[PDB]
Design a protein around this ligand. Sequence first.
Ligand code: GTP
Ligand code: MG
Ligand code: MG
Ligand code: MG
Ligand code: MG
Ligand code: MG
Ligand code: MG
Length: 141
Amino acid sequence: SARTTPIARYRNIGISAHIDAGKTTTTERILFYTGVNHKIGEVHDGAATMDWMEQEQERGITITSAATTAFWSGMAKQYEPHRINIIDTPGHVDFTIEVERSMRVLDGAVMVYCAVGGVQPQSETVWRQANKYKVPRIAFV
RNA sequence: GUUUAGAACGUCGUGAGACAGUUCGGUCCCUAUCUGCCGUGGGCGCUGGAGAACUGAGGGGGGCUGCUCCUAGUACGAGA
Ligand SMILES: Nc1nc2c(ncn2[C@@H]2O[C@H](COP(=O)(O)OP(=O)(O)OP(=O)(O)O)[C@@H](O)[C@H]2O)c(=O)[nH]1
Ligand SMILES: [Mg+2]
Ligand SMILES: [Mg+2]
Ligand SMILES: [Mg+2]
Ligand SMILES: [Mg+2]
Ligand SMILES: [Mg+2]
Ligand SMILES: [Mg+2]
């Protein structure tokens, strides 16, 4: 019953953005690259793993906050396998509670942004929710 | 179906009968002369006669559209 991964190698990251900014797409790609999934499933095809719930495969949105983990070592494997507990949160204003609950406990965040339209009405809302809890965040255009 | 002759009901009439009342049953002919049209030939013409290949003035035919997929979850839209 020893420590499998050192606690310094943990990353409690999570995704928050405006609707259709590409949160679920990034997580799907992560899982695939890290080896958790064996295929890439698109969200508008209903085949993304993070949108597990029906009315999420049908409508094409994310409603709940689903938490998974993965092991990433770097491109050229520059470090030991770090464990990332990535969390995909919905970007809609109808589910702001699903961001705040997930950003209560996240150690790090990353604010993904659409390149053609950068800062959208819900981009500012998840930014204020993140700085409420003083979360250190990155940005992925 | 309606629009003959048979019969019956309801109704009307003393009655024969009658009802845009309703019921059952009840003969639909024509070998195409002309025009028209569809085809298919004969004659003559086109200026010596003939065999072929053509040009195109003109005429006719034809012209319908669904559903998916890509563009693209792109434009628009806070979102949907
Ligand atoms: N051209 C292009 N389309 C992308 C890209 N990333 C995502 N999309 C499309 O945008 C939609 C994905 O947006 P999502 O990330 O699934 O929605 P979300 O950001 O996870 O957040 P919620 O809607 O609240 O659940 C799909 O149609 C994607 O194919 C990209 O990098 N380039
Ligand atoms: Mg858009
Ligand atoms: Mg959508
Ligand atoms: Mg999503
Ligand atoms: Mg005549
Ligand atoms: Mg013509
Ligand atoms: Mg599409």
